[PDB]
Amino acid sequence: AAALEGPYPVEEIRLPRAGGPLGLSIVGGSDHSSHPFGVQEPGVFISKVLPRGLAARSGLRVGDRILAVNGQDVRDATHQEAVSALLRPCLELSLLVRRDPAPPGLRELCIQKAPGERLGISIRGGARGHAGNPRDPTDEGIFISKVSPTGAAGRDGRLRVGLRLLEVNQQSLLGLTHGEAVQLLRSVGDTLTVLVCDGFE
């Protein structure tokens, strides 16, 4: 019946469709791992909400679990099925969402890299090579494994071993392999903007 035994509030949020973009990003599905949004129970989650965007104005937050889209159950829908349902022409986009909490210790860190200075960290994970979380093998998250005092992260001090990496310079690492994440972390300029939450501290 899809209502409403959860400890988190379930709300039906409508988004006006007047030609503009949704201004939201989703992760998860029936074929995608959604850590750290779906640990106990997997599903479709909103990973990113653009500021001053349509979703932001409507009241959508990061970490919201999408239960239904215009009446259609999307709890066990494919990622592409969720996308198609959101981008589907309708008078009013109705979203049944549950207010699941945002990832623990979610914070955006900015790190300055001096000229000729490396970042000085090693990462573990993630997709197609799950190893980042040895305690939770099913997790394809990307974690910081080592932190060198010589690098920019050591001079910063905010990065520590165990933190989960979510975004690197406005690019989600969710679903990416180890090599793809390394490549993104190497291709950054003198400024590293990373979305970080707690991992296996």
* Residues found near Cl ion in the complex (CB under 5 A): 17-20, 118-119
Q: Where are the beta strands (DSSP E) in 76-182?
A: 92-98, 107-112, 121-124, 142-147, 164-168
Residue closer to Cl ion (CB basis): 19 or 149:
19
Residue closer to Cl ion (CB basis): 84 or 138:
84
Residue closer to Cl ion (CB basis): 39 or 87:
87
Name the minimum Å distance from CB 49 to Cl ion.
15
Residue closer to Cl ion (CB basis): 1 or 18:
18
Name the minimum Å distance from CB 159 to Cl ion.
12
Q: Which of 21, 20, 40, 38 is nearest to 29 (CA)?
A: 38
Tokens of 151: 């690098």
Name the minimum Å distance from CB 119 to Cl ion.
4
Q: Which of 32, 59, 54 is nearest to 45 (CA)?
A: 32
**Backbone breaks in the chain after residues (C–N over 2.5 Å):** none
Name the minimum Å distance from CB 15 to Cl ion.
7
